[model samples]
Target chain A: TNKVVILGSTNVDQFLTVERYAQPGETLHVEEAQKAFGGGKGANQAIATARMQADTTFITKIGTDGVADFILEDFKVAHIDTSYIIKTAEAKTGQAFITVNAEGQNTIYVYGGANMTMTPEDVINAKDAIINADFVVAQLEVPIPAIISAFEIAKAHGVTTVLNPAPAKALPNELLSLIDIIVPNETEAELLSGIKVTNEQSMKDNANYFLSIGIKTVLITLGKQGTYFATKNQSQHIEAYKVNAIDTTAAGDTFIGAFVSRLNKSQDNLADAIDFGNKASSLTVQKHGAQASIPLLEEVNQV
Target chain B: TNKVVILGSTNVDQFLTVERYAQPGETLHVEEAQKAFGGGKGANQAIATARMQADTTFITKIGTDGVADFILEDFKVAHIDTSYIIKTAEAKTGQAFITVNAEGQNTIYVYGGANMTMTPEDVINAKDAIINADFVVAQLEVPIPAIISAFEIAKAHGVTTVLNPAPAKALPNELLSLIDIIVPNETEAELLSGIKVTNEQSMKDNANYFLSIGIKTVLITLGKQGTYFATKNQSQHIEAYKVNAIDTTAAGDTFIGAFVSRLNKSQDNLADAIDFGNKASSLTVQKHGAQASIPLLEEVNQV
Candidate 1:
């Protein structure tokens, strides 16, 4: 079986569901609440790929104690290989303190914890896994140096590389040229390309800008409006399934994972991957929580 | 009204209730759970004092974000004056991960967070409140310097001092002499006095050893058999109420709190204080949690 390798942060999500937006310095009463699974882009993609029956290795860093151990158990239950996971004693496990209001809109405070301190040596440890990966994905939760190290290893092994530029921050163009796909959501696309992705033409224009900078492909996801795909020879827009979202937590991650899983399984054609990605992401927005909302293969097939 | 000024730690205790003893390194499945207020020895004692209806003030350090805010609100709801509470920007709030087995025994691990860095300056900042207190209590959670400073300040101002020698460790003889009464269970009594307290006779022997060491009085509390108080003049043994202990979590602190409250208000003799302590502990073991188990003044009188 082809394997999908995800590199990122793993965290336990602490969620407080409230009735409304929290005003600064004003204490708001939580109506109903729960803590569900969560992580940064790395763990989300790993979980999604594993659910779609791809052999997935999630390489991440977390504290060696307390809830970090529990999160490893989650990896075990999800059938994702956790052997590559690093437990660091120097810092606490990464965590997200999230506040959700009635409309399912939420705000979060992220503590980098063990994730932020992940070293280049930690990335070097995942070399064998990356070498065998049919698709290798990464995000910005880990240190930029570590991500760069991992990208170099993936490129050396000829692994297909996917990068999700989220939390809309600056990226080194040197690293951009090494990735096969630069997956940016609408906001990120607008910020980097200086072109608002309000329509197909703008999305193509934004995707083309990244292409011009030497990235092999550009997939600009416009959330509910769907995705715009652009490569050397083709550029087309795909529509998304309509749903009143309860939480859009891992929607983009689901699409990325589904797309990668399909490609890894020899369904490499863009149209097939897009249909599968659309179905998987549609399932994600209707539910709440990170990683918890990623659909299993059976659920996606039914949809 | 006598106010008991407390410099302590604060935490939100996440508890897992289980049916039997859970061995170390063994994973046991527990289905039921509850979240309660808990913390280091300082926090429990402060809340216990508050429950005794003393005009109580608690000074503790906690993070400015997340669950610590909720617990500070809980302190306000419980009528504890939190004017001395310090919120730190850089560290996490303390939290205790606890598991209560069927025998009502608990195992806990604490993340000290902002509480770990509690300084002598923090204690000094509450000097006005401490000076006004009728009885100043001390525990071992904060730094040794803070404890030394508090004891010196209280003794200089003629405030009676009570010490709960728990989480058992040795202390300097100089600090020991400054305390008016040293209250300890059999384990701590044995550790501190070098005399094993297995029965009433043993308890008296152990209490006397503590008294001989320059502590004005010593109270060796043997659970169920009651408290043994020793002073230069006399030794008194008080019996415990024979009741089914639902949770013995805060029984000892309740005993100390209620005993000190009464002694500060009216009781001039050590015998009267020991009797009141026994009455308070008897009412406590029959209830659940820490502060929740503490009885009101009328309830203690009835017991």
Candidate 2:
């Protein structure tokens, strides 16, 4: 089994269903709200690798509150290694608030909570897990400085570093130099490269932008147009698999998760791994919820 | 020492401070939401009695969930007796949702939760505490049938029953006949007695209306106008106390709690007890938040 270390966020997501906006000065009585597990880049992707049978160790922080106990217990059942998670006194476990109206439309708010409390020293303390991993996955859900610390550790030990630049924001150039593979979806790709993407072949400009900036590999995720990847020597556009989608909340996370897991196991081929990632996400959007939508290895193989 | 039995709702109140309500399809990002202890009729009154040195026992239900654990731990710190609480799987601990905007205006949503799951049989299960108490305070926050069973038990044991007819709605004749004292605000009084409140003597009609219906005592709480009380042979209006007003979220609850505690201790004078209730709530409205605003015995004497 390949070891993958996930450094990101963990959260208890509360979803409210309302008739309309309960405008200021008016009380909107929602009959019920749902509480679900949501880890944007870190949680869903970590669960993805574990569900695909990769041995996964997740590093994150949670508050010393009931929600922390609530989240830690769930990680055990999901089978992700929980030994390296840090319980911090600085803030509560991260929380995400979601509201869905009668139109089935929803809005989301994320609180950095304990995720922002991760420091360079905290990652340095878990240096053992970083050194032994086949791949070290980090995301923008957590603070960039903390990610930089882990990325530096992974690079020093010769482990591949995967960065999912989501809820996309600017990155410090020093950290960018350590990324072995940087993945971003269309608009996220647009934001990072400052390049407008119109089609798959035209993504070469987007890929080269990152390569010249010291990023070793560029993977751009296109919603319906499939994906484009480029390295120092070669580039290829992979076709997306077709599927009926009901909810697409975790598609990008699932894609990145599946792609990395397959790549870790088969270093000789890249296209087949991309196809595996596409198949996993194609299966994902057809279902609902984030972690629940992820496909297991057998389910991924079936398609 | 006098014993006061409290039968009503206990909740983990969630307060959201938002710039404005997040409309449908738009994600509203709130930085933080606060979690608090809010026991509308049952909890605040029990704490009120306990803080005043009355032997207080609280009878309620909570879900077998995390919020229930959150609430139960708080009740102990507040010093209310918790032995009679039933942890059930039917629903969660009651929840009150409050959102305050930048203008400081707020809207609220209250979920009955485990409070609604309360049954007559549940009250029957705690008969020993009812049989021994000097007073029983109940509210409309829980189901009327549950209140009915408890009131009938209190009546059989000659335990005086205090009803804070709130979130005002129609009450059944069976409950009205069992109440030794029924308190209502001017608006709530108009709903209960079908009499408009104008002045002290005018409230005689409001009191008479309840007397005619078998409710023995009537106390009308007039915001700044003080209080009016009446029984078969006696009736009087107490003048209001002065205080700089701030948040009035728990004023009525604080008053009802303080009133019952004082009455249990000094049964010889009803008017003095009423004044004590007014004093506690007067001090209450001068502060902020529920339960937190309640005056202890010392605070009441200081005011």
Candidate 3:
């Protein structure tokens, strides 16, 4: 069994379903208020891997609050290893205020809280897991330095590293150089590469920009259009399956999670892995809730 | 059959359990994250009254968020009438951020949201219910003008009015004159009356201050020591029943709820009502959650 190590954040997502997006300063009556488990990039992706039958270990930090307990329980239920989670004192467990409109699109405000408190020393403590894993995944929800440290350790052991640059921001080239695979949605790719991704030409140009910066591979997610995969030698656009979407909250997490789970086991067959990810993500958008909406590997296979 | 109407606020209480509170710039590990039904004073007290077998109607405003649905479901279960609830587009549903220490003591920060948007016109629309009820209750959680308008309607019909001056603040005499009974905790009594209530003398002086104003009666809640009741004709102190507390979040709400429920039924037995209120509140503190912790009339009778 291939081992997958994920470093990320955990949050309690408080969801409010509305008729439509409210204009600024306008109040909209919500159809419902619900709370759900929303693992940060690391946690969701990890669960995505675990549900795909990968031996997954999830590492994150949380404040001493009830939300932490809920997250821990979810990990156990998802069958992800929880031994390396750090209960920190610097802040409360993170929270994401999510508002889902009638169209199933969502607006989110994230309070980093304890997710921002993970230190370089904390990363060192999980070094063994990082070094032994076949795949190491990290997200922008956590501190960049911690991700760098984990990826640096993985590089030394010849383990592949995946980075999901979400809620996009500028990143130093030094950190980008350590990553083997970088996955970002269209909006995030545009923000990072400064190339507007409107057509096939722009999408390929954006992928070339990341490759020129020493990144090994680029995977740009397009919601309905599917994913664009780019390596130095080849490029391909994977199409998404059509489905009625209820909530598109964790689609990207599901894609990256499914993709990495397949890649860690095969090491080749890049196209097959991309198809698996697209299928898994399609199942996610058809449901509601974050981690709870992710598809199992068998379910993804049936689709 | 005496009828009661509660004009208050409804909030979703998000709780965090911790070893202790974090000091300035300090971080604490939270033991858990839990959500509970935390109606404003009006909602809690109304449920308290309903649990004690009163005919109760609760009037409040909530944003069109999912939290309103949760509150409506809770009210249905508690047997509180929900017809007068205003689902407005002015704001989102209210929320309370609460931190409970190991000792069961807690600190709370409440965001009023839609609760603050309730207008005097909203209360006027419910005028018939207020005028026809045996008693009407209001709290400071909502906008004061809304409370005043409701109380004014109750006063014109000779319906008894109860006010819980919590989260102590200054009050104009015009509003005070409309209230038949004003309930406040020891700290709140001190703030409203400008008297330190450490001893019998100070407590009596504080109660007298409210009576000296246009208010007809005053009840001050003193934890463990019990309640201090004062009216134009007499003054008395009722002792509290001792109990180990698991959480004290809604203790005062139970007291006021039970007191009013009993008072509307038996118009002349202040002492018995005080004892009943004390017993009910004692039961609340021994349990772990708000709304879920309030005791029923049969349970209180057995005690």
Candidate 4:
């Protein structure tokens, strides 16, 4: 079994169900308030990987605040190894305030809190584990320096590395060169490539842009359009599996997790793995909440 | 039956239990994190009155965000009338992040959010309820203009008004003149009167400052030292009952509610009412949470 290590963030997510987004200075009444455990783009993908039967280890930082309990307990339940997780007193665990409208569109406000305090030294302490992993995964939820440190160590060990530039921000070339695969959604792809991704051609252009920069493989996730895969010698578009989408909160995370899990199990079949990811994410969007919506491997295979 | 009307704010209180206060740039681990329903002077006193079996009507504005549901359901459970409550899409329901140390001392950060947006028009819409009430109670959680507007209407109908000057801010004389009784903690009394309250003499001096401003009676809460009640011809200190204090979050709210409840039940016995308030608040400090800790009149009477 391939061992996957994730470094990311953990947040306490508060969801408000409203009729629609409010205009400035306008007051609207929400129909409901819901709270769930979230955060850790790394943790989300790690959970997705573990649930899909990958041997997963999750590394993250949390404040000694109350929300940390929810994150740790959930990880234990999902069988994600947590030995490398760090608890700090720097700030409260992260919080995400989400407003979801009747149409299922959401506006989210995330407070990095403790997630921002993770130092490169913290990643250095987990260097052995990162180097030993079959794959090292990270997301933008945590401090970029810490991500770079882990990726740096993973590269030295010749371990495969994946970076999901979500809640996306511009990255340095140094970090980009270290990532074996760069997975980004349509919006992130557009921002990173400076190209509007409306059709297959634009998606391919974005993929090439990432490939030109040193990322070995570019997997651009296209919501209803599926995913575009680009390597130096291979380029293709995989159509998304249609499903009744309920909540798309963790769909992207699900895709990355399922795709990586399939690649580790069946080497040299990127196209089939993309299809597997599409099916898993289709299942994810049909449910609500973050980790709560992740399907098991058996469930995904059966679907 | 005398009807008591409360205009206040509703908040979702998140409590983090820590060893000691964190120094600047220092991080500390909390022993536990807990969430409970809380708000300032308005909601607390309303719950206090309702739990004591007063004919209580609570008027407030809340965001359409999820926390409003907790407020409404709590009001219903306490039998507090909520017909005057307004739900707006403007801001989130207020929130209070509280940090409590081992000794039960607390530091609180309140985000007024929707509570701050309550306009004078919102209070005027509830004018009939305030005017017809036996007593109109309010706190500094809402806009000062709205408080003045409600007090103005109350005075026109000769309804008694009690003001709890909490989160104490300096008030205009016009607003001061309309308050029949001023209830403030020792700290608030100092800020309002500019008197350094160190002993019995300074306490009286501060009480006199409020009396000089046209407030008919001044009640200064002195924590475990008890309450000081002063008027033109009457003055006395009511000793607080000794109890094992667990949480003092709503102690003052319990005092005001019990004092008003007792006053309504026994006209012309101000000293007895103060003592009743002391008993109720002493009981309140021995429990945890806000509304959950308030004592009913029967419980206070029994104690």
Q: What is the TM-score of each candidate against the true structure?
A: 0.47, 0.47, 0.47, 0.47
Q: Residue by residue across B1-303, what tens digits does model 3's lDDT show?
A: 358898887777777766678999997775345646555766777777777777889888898877758657767877788878898877888878877675556687999988889999999988878878988988888988898898888888789998988768888877888988898888889888889889999978987888888788788888767788888787898888743333244667777777877784335788888887777766543311111112222322232
Docking class of 3: incorrect
Clashing pairs in 2: none
Candidate 3 or 2, higher lDDT:
3
> Individual DockQ of the candidates?
0.01, 0.01, 0.01, 0.01
Encode model 2's per-residue lDDT on A13-50: one tens digit a residue: 77776769777799778655564555445877777776
Worst 10 residues of 1 chain A by lDDT: A287-296
Q: For model 2, how does the per-residue alpha-carbon lDDT over B172-230 read when each residue is reduced to its tens digit?
A: 89888898889998888998878789966669989999999888778998877788898
Which runs of model 4 end up more than 4 angstroms from their true locations? A29-34, A243-247, A265-267, A287-303, B1-303
Q: Model 4 over residues B75-164: C-alpha lDDT tens digits?
A: 787878888998888898887887767555778899998889999899999887887788888899998999999999999988998899
Q: Is candidate 1 or candidate 3 better by TM-score?
A: 3
Which 10-residue window in model 2 chain B sums to the lowest lDDT? Answer: B287-296
What DockQ class does candidate 1 belong to?
Answer: incorrect
RMSD of every prediction: 23.1, 16.0, 17.5, 18.7
**In terms of docking quality, how is candidate 2 classified?**
incorrect
Please report, as a residue range, the 10-residue window in candidate 3 chain B with the lowest summed lDDT: B287-296
List residue ranges in candidate 1 displaced over 4 A: A31-36, A243-247, A264-268, A286-303, B1-303
lDDT of 3 by residue, A115-204 (tens): 888878898998888888999888988989888888889898898888898769888877889988888888889988999998999989
**What stretches of model 2 exceed 4 Å from their correct place?**
A23-26, A34-36, A242-248, A287-303, B1-303
